[PDB]
């Protein structure tokens, strides 16, 4: 809970000063981090989806939830209810630990990392970023890797706007370019 204790001990005060909030409850919070793997290659091979789930479990520390097609789509040859991905919702202690591991270990291991886009906010202070290769997480062993897979990471926050979301993330020294 290093980053949560840092949030409470420093980031709250910093944001209160920076935005002049009238109550401490008004400070943006990091609510949840969701990791998503869109596994379209599972349409023909189910071991692909199972291996994606194993990668996600290794990375996040949580057994993932297999997601299924909401509607049938000819364009991707998918019928309704077909499992085509996996996600994990990280909250609380697990979420702060993953935030720390991401920031301090995984992002530094991104090939040719020149800084995360600061425009990748959804308009309400929530940040999403892509990963192209799961090896950037040390939990994934390099010489056991079957297929190259990435994932999506979303950080949902209680920020009313993108500027407050970016300030909240920057307070953790998020690697914004």
């Amino acid at each position: 809970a290093k980053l949560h204790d840092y949030y409470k001990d420093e980031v709250v005060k910093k944001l209160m000063t920076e935005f002049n909030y009238n109550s401490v409850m008004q400070v943006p919070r990091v609510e949840k981090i969701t990791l998503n793997m869109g596994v379209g290659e599972a349409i023909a091979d189910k071991k692909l989806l199972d291996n994606a789930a194993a990668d996600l479990a290794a990375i996040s520390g949580q057994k993932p939830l297999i997601t299924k097609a909401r509607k049938s789509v000819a364009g991707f040859k998918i019928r309704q209810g077909y499992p085509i991905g996996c996600k994990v919702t990280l909250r609380g202690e697990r979420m702060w630990e993953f935030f720390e591991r991401l920031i301090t270990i995984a992002v530094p291991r991104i090939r040719d990392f020149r800084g995360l886009s600061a425009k990748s906010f959804d308009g309400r202070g929530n940040y999403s970023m892509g990963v192209r290769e799961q090896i950037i997480f040390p939990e994934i062993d390099y010489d056991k890797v079957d297929r190259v897979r990435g994932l999506d990471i979303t950080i949902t926050t209680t920020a009313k706007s993108d500027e407050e979301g970016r300030a909240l993330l920057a307070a953790f020294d998020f690697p914004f370019r």
């Binding site: 479990a57 290794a58 990375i59 520390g61 949580q62 057994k63 697990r94 630990e97 720390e100 591991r101 920031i103 301090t104 270990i105 992002v107 530094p108 291991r109 990392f113 020149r114 800084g115 040390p138 939990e139 020294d173 690697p175």
Partner: protein, 60 residues
Amino acid sequence: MKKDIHPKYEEITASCSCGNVMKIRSTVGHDLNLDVCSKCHPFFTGKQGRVDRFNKRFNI
């Protein structure tokens, strides 16, 4: 958390070359030997035309 279905999640030590050590819970199982970390990566730290070269090569 539901019992008996999640990966093993226990603390390890991440040792970087620059001498940074972080104690992080992980599913990796063993200790880590990082080649880089947030405290030493060039982008994190801050460590990251023709007339000039024409004059340098053709000094008169």
